[PDB]
Design a protein around this nucleic acid. Structure first.
Lengths: 150, 126, 52, 108, 139, 51
RNA sequence: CGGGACCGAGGACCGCGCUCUGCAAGGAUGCUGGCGUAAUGGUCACCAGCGACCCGUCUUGAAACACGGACCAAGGAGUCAAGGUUUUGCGCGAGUGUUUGGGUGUAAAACCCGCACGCGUAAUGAAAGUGAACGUAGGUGAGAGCUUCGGCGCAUCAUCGAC
RNA sequence: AAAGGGAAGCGCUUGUGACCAGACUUGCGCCCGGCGGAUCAUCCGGUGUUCUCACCGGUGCACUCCGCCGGGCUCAGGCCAG
């Protein structure tokens, strides 16, 4: 018998999405290939956030994107592995290039009316396969009724 | 035809796992049931008792589901079913379903003889 | 066939949805020059030789 | 569904005051802040005002038609004059409207 | 666009009408499936370029997908019937599968299926008779 | 331009007419959502039983 | 330098090497005989050597006591509804919810329609009532990722401020 | 058919008797000899395709291809063993 005071620990992290979305499966395959074949930690983080669930992917608003676009980030491509929502309180949408899982109709329309570009994550993988010149953004995780009631 | 070359087929155990006290009670079927009593001799694994099944009795992955000839049984109901084994005559053997009539059995046997596919129960209904 | 577009334009509160994937051809995406020109060298093959 | 339950797996192993006759319609007064005030304008017309193609026209917004009785003062307004007709208004909301160059009228 | 061979494989990898699932393996009834195996490599109806071989009265019959007529099923197949020497049939099938980059990974499977069909078309030999064994079967 | 689709007559032959393909034919194909809505919808004509 | 036992996993090549025409060097080959069938193998019955308390259930710390079991077939026990809460998937998203109702129908299905309304979008106070930007929506230290290599700094945490 | 000197029943492993499932029967490749045929190579035209690969129709005039039968050789073949 082997004295094992310490216990080998199984992984406490998602290795595959629980979603049955076939397009998400294709995106997971693409970013698995990218994270295996590239140096860039951006691809590994994007593959991780593709694995993540919906409460772990809070939405990001155009006003939050405009806040993070200040101070030398005006030309960086904004990457959000979540839903991008529209904010009525932002009256002037700046020109921006944003890649996301999905946009709302108002957010996409206001970005394209301001003159920016909306991309999907496969278009992002095509144009920036190493994640160069990119601003990676996340929404507020703790802004939830359950988290407030914790 | 002769099967593809394979490692020798090893069965770690050929005896079945008999249910406890099914020898003494006719209302108990001999199919395995795990004892759940806290004072059960078999469940506590005293020596001289019935062995309990476990994953350590598992068969070699290269020879699992192999009949002694080296083939894997594939159930067939018709000629279109037995023609699926056209490319697998060295690995798979056809087995005619029990509810297939005699005429269709002759047709399946003739087609498998043409395809070089072994039929495990070719002597049936003759 | 002609009336299908008017039928799907007359649905109030519903638009034709936007996909999360723009190019569904994963082979073209992976084997495109844009991805393949920045990849590392392969660190192995599909079959690995047994060392000892 | 019954087949997905754990039970199939576990088979084999088992102050203040009182208000009599309260009417909520007395106290109905929904509120809106000033940073959502421009969202009441229709989208095309709002975009024309925000671009600046209308330099001689001032929009009149009726809050009671949109379902609001009080204008509150959270946020900031652009430098465009707006006419606001409201039953109630807060001091900061009216101050910010007058800074923007408009006027808050009182209605019933 | 929104439709690709990868998408069709993700849709029909778990269930399709061609699937024959049993304990000892999963097979496919697809006409464009070489070796009748359920895999992305051999799913002919999934793949944009695909080959399939069926028996004829004498020889083989090879169908191939046309990539310009995917939405026109009546004219989607390029069909050649090989009724000649087996070596010429193998040469033509291997050229059709490998020379222009049309699924060079299916070359061995296509030549093997052609050989299997041409060998099955040969006359069968009479079997040796069954010998009674033991005591109860013999007597 | 948008793709076209051929129109066929009562003899099975094309009539020389083409129609513009509707935009609903390029919608995403989601088997999980189809299964969810089908599971919900196939119960809507059920009559109740009780002892 | 002998004598003996058990074992032969892998399956084109690649490597480390050596005593270098080759090899005992990243896992057994070569030669030969008998038989080609119940001979090997398997199942059942029985003898033999060794081994082996009758099952639940209950009790406490545990046994013992106690209680149930003549045998067999068929039933036979964590279900449904309402309302919460956390997590998973999905649609839409500062909105969301067609199905009380209306239209329509190939007629309890499917499809379509919208007013009100519910929840959310603002809180606090017993109440009258009042009602959320000094600042690129603040400062400091961390912080993935990115960077023009000077820094910019998501989420989140600690802390000092502002309303 | 079998066992039984104050219980039977069960586990491991032989043995005996009874009864059985497989496996095997030959395949493939060469060298000769004898038959039956020309869907051998090249060229021309048409057609289809993956646009360079095929099929079809004329051309082979038998040292070239494809089947069948007699011989010989090599290799691979079942069970137990030295």
């Amino acid at each position: 018998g082997i004295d094992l005071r310490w216990k080998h620990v199984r992984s406490s992290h998602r290795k595959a999405p629980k979603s049955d979305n076939v397009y998400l499966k294709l995106l997971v395959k693409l970013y698995r290939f990218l994270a295996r074949r590239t140096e860039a930690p951006f691809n590994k983080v994007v593959l991780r956030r593709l694995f993540m669930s919906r409460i772990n992917r809070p939405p990001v608003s155009l006003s939050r994107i405009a806040r993070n676009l200040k101070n030398g980030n005006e030309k960086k491509t904004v990457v959000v592995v979540a839903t991008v929502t529209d904010d009525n309180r932002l009256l002037q949408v700046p020109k921006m290039e944003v890649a996301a899982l999905r946009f709302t109709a108002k957010a996409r329309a206001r970005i394209e009316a301001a003159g920016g570009r909306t991309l999907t994550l496969d278009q992002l993988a095509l144009e920036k396969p190493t994640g160069a010149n990119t601003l990676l953004l996340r929404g507020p995780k703790n802004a939830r009724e359950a988290v407030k009631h914790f | 035809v002769a099967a593809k070359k394979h490692v020798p087929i090893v069965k770690k155990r050929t005896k079945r796992f008999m249910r406890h006290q099914s020898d003494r009670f006719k209302c108990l079927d001999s199919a395995w049931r795990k004892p759940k009593g806290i004072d059960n001799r078999v469940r506590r694994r005293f020596k001289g008792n019935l062995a309990m099944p476990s994953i350590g009795y598992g068969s070699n992955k290269k020879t699992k589901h192999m009949m002694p000839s080296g083939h894997k049984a594939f159930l067939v109901h018709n000629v279109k079913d037995v023609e699926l084994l056209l490319m697998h005559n060295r690995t798979y053997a056809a087995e005619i379903a029990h509810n297939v009539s005699s005429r269709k059995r002759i047709d399946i046997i003739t087609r498998a003889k043409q395809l070089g596919v072994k039929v495990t129960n070719a002597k049936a209904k003759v | 066939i002609k009336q299908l577009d008017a039928v799907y334009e007359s649905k109030k509160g519903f638009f034709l949805p936007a996909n999360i994937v723009s190019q569904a051809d994963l082979s073209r995406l992976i084997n495109s020059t844009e991805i393949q020109s920045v990849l590392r060298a392969p660190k192995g093959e599909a079959r690995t030789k047994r060392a000892c | 569904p019954t087949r997905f339950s754990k039970t199939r797996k576990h088979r084999g192993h088992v102050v203040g005051m009182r208000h009599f006759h309260l009417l909520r319609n007395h106290y109905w007064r929904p509120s809106i802040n000033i940073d959502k005030l421009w969202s009441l304008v229709p989208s095309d017309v709002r975009e024309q005002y925000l671009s600046g193609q209308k330099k001689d026209t001032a929009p009149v917004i009726d809050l009671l038609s949109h379902g609001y009785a009080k204008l509150l003062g959270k946020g900031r307004l652009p430098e465009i004059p707006v006419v606001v007709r409201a039953r109630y208004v807060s001091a900061e909301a009216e101050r910010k409207v007058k800074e923007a160059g408009g006027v808050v009228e009182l209605v019933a | 666009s929104n439709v690709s061979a990868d998408l069709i494989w993700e849709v029909s990898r778990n269930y399709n009408s061609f699937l024959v699932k049993q304990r000892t393996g999963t097979f496919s009834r697809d006409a464009l499936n070489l070796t009748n195996q359920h895999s992305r490599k051999h799913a002919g109806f999934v793949n944009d370029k695909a080959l399939g071989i069926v028996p004829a009265e004498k020889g083989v019959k090879v169908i191939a997908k046309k990539v310009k007529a995917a939405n026109k099923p009546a004219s989607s197949l390029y069909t050649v019937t090989y009724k000649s020497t087996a070596r010429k049939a193998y040469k033509a099938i291997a050229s059709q599968a490998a020379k222009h980059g049309y699924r060079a990974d299916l070359r061995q499977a296509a030549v093997a299926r052609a050989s299997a069909i041409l060998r099955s078309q040969r006359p069968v030999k009479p079997e040796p008779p069954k010998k009674l064994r033991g005591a109860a079967a013999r007597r | 331009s948008r793709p076209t689709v051929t129109v066929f007559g009562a003899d099975g032959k094309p009539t020389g007419a083409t129609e513009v393909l509707p935009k609903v034919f390029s919608a995403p194909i989601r088997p999980d959502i189809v299964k969810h809505v089908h599971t919900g919808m196939a119960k809507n004509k059920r009559q109740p039983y009780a002892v």
